[PDB]
Structure formats: structure tokens, C-alpha cells
Ligand SMILES: [Zn+2]
């Protein structure tokens with residue numbers, strides 16, 4: 001559980017740094033909110049849901065299904081964007097990385 | 100030029116929809132600003148730089164080098180995130196897409 005939780009937390013961290021929108025049903029409230037991470041003073045990152053009125057709830061390590069579902073959707077969106085980059089370089093002749 | 104410009108504009112559109120942060124040196128000002136797209140009333144999407152005080156400048160079709168450079172950086176960031184998803188699924192056993 002802790003492994004799976006930290007890998008999810010690590011992805012959410014990376015995506016949040018990029019600006020990537022993520023939303024999920026909170027395991028605690030039932031309410032929709034934004035998926036984020038919090039870092040304890042000791043350097044451990046855990047997952048939370050921030051509900052649009054400010055309320056934030058910790059995601060239990062045994063219940064990350066809704067977070068994994070959203071990470072799945074994000075993964076597909078990023079795959080699609082990269083497929084288009086590949087198309088525009090290989091079929092379109094665009095050299096995005098001038099080299 | 101128009102082809103290359105529209106493919107870049109199409110990527111910027113997709114990334115902006117995802118929330119992905121993009122910044123570049125404006126071909127007109129010299130100033131740094133955020134890369135975005137604008138859509139004419141007739142449905143054509145062109146590229147602009149929005150400078151943090153509100154000033155927005157059209158990017159000429161013959162001068163998209165700084166936009167392509169940033170799209171290159173974004174591409175590498177997204178490749179890195181997907182490499183980590185692949186690692187966490189294949190080596191970490193995490194099934195992000197429950198199926
Ligand atoms: Zn909640």
C-alpha cells in the first residue's frame with residue numbers, strides 16, 4: 001500500500017508542478033475536489049482532496065482507487081498530446097527541438 | 100509556414116486545456132510572457148504572448164522559434180512523466196487504469 005501510495009503521490013507531484021488539472025471523488029466526503037499533495041515537516045508527501053470551498057481531506061493509504069482512476073485519465077491525455085507531437089514532427093516536418 | 104504555425108497552435112491549444120504552463124520570449128517585445136492562443140470570430144487559432152501586466156502580442160507566422168523551443172521543453176517534461184508512469188506500472192505493479 002505504502003509503495004503504491006507513494007508512486008501515485010510522486011506522479012501527482014510532477015503533474016501539479018506542470019500545472020496539470022486533476023479532480024476526483026474524495027474517499028472521505030463523497031464530494032468532488034482537486035487532487036493534490038502535502039508535505040509534512042519531515043519530508044513525507046501524502047495525498048489530499050481540496051474541495052472548492054477550501055475543505056481538504058487526507059486520502060487513506062488503503063483507498064486510492066479514485067486517485068488512480070484520475071491518473072489513468074491524465075495518462076491517456078498526455079499520451080494523446082505526445083502522439084500529436086510525434087505526428088507533427090514525423091509526418092508534419094516540424095522540428096520542435098531545434099537540433 | 101502556415102502548416103508549422105497551425106501545428107504549434109494546435110499543441111499550445113491542447114496543453115492550455117490541460118493546464119500546462121508555457122512561457123517564451125516574445126518575438127515582438129523581447130519580453131517574457133505566457134504562450135497562448137486566440138480564436139478569431141471565424142474559427143482560426145493564432146499564437147500570442149501574454150505579458151504578465153496584460154499586454155498581449157501576436158506571434159508572426161515567420162517567427163515561431165521561441166514557441167517551438169518551449170514546446171520542445173514541454174515535450175521532454177511530458178515524456179519524463181510518462182516514463183515514470185511506465186516504470187510505476189511495469190516495475191512497481193501499479194495498475195493506474197483499472198482494467
Ligand atoms: Zn473530502
Ligand SMILES: [Zn+2]
Pocket residue numbers: 125126127128129130148150155156
Ligand atoms: Zn510582446
